[PDB]
Amino acid sequence: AHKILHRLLQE
Amino acid sequence: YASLTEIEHLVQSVCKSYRETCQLRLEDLLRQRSNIFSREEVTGYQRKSMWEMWERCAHHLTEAIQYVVEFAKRLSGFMELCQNDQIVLLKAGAMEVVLVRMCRAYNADNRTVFFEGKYGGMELFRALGCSELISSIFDFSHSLSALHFSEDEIALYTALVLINAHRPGLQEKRKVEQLQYNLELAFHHHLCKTHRQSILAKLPPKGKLRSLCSQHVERLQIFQHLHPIVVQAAFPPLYKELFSTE
Ligand SMILES: CC(=O)N1CCN(c2ccc(CN(C3CCC3)S(=O)(=O)c3ccccc3)c(F)c2)CC1
Numbered sequence: 001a002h003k004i005l006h007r008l009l010q011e
Numbered sequence: 012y013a014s015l016t017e018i019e020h021l022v023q024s025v026c027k028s029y030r031e032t033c034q035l036r037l038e039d040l041l042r043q044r045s046n047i048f049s050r051e052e053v054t055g056y057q058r059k060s061m062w063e064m065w066e067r068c069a070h071h072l073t074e075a076i077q078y079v080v081e082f083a084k085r086l087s088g089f090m091e092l093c094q095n096d097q098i099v100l101l102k103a104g105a106m107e108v109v110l111v112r113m114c115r116a117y118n119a120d121n122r123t124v125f126f127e128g129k130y131g132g133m134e135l136f137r138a139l140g141c142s143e144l145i146s147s148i149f150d151f152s153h154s155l156s157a158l159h160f161s162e163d164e165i166a167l168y169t170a171l172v173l174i175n176a177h178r179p180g181l182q183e184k185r186k187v188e189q190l191q192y193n194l195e196l197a198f199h200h201h202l203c204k205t206h207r208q209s210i211l212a213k214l215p216p217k218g219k220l221r222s223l224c225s226q227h228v229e230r231l232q233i234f235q236h237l238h239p240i241v242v243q244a245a246f247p248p249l250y251k252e253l254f255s256t257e
Contacts, residue, residue, distance in 0.1 A: 001251065003252065004252050005080070005098050005249070005252065009080070009094060
């Protein structure tokens, strides 16, 4: 998978 | 920042942010130094498949990176940057911070690193098939060990490793330049007050950390080529986003 950072930052 | 009060507020803010995201406490890491892998266990680690050993290391690295993300999230000034730049900084910086963070879990007296509940040497990672990368990292940790970093110093240096204005892809370079400067002012102020400015000339270059991250990616691409299904099936998503670049 990918685009994990975005999810981690928005939380 | 136009006063010592403000800069000293930044110092403490950054230290506090590191404390709340250090993953493993310094006390805990020191209290486990006599807990070293036996030769039976070492031989067991060496007899593990290359792909499982890569998988375990990838999992632990990714776990470590999550705490670097949270450090960054709690870092004064970082969340006010646009997320594009937050992602540019973390893509290029996360691994580096972890490499610097790793010297706390490294024992210079016997040359062992804390890994899966015990301390082990370079030979513990022989199954990976990337001897140079391992030696380099162990040497990198060994030379940081020689500086006897305090927790405060670690925090400020890692903040500066993360907040680097010269990363390609930054849309707000000037904003990142300003943050860096303030963190640099804080770091140097702390070192001045604490009579520790001598370590400045002993910090390794920006090129050294980059050389270590470059190597990590090289070796992954070689492993990726041999076990592409394991990378897809068995590696952490965040690891692949940061390093696999497919
Ligand atoms: C915060 C803290 O103190 N810790 C303890 C050390 N911990 C750790 C991380 C990665 C590796 C694995 N890697 C290095 C260690 C020598 C090999 S690595 O991620 O750089 C790597 C992964 C895959 C291939 C080669 C190296 C490892 F063993 C431990 C991170 C968390």
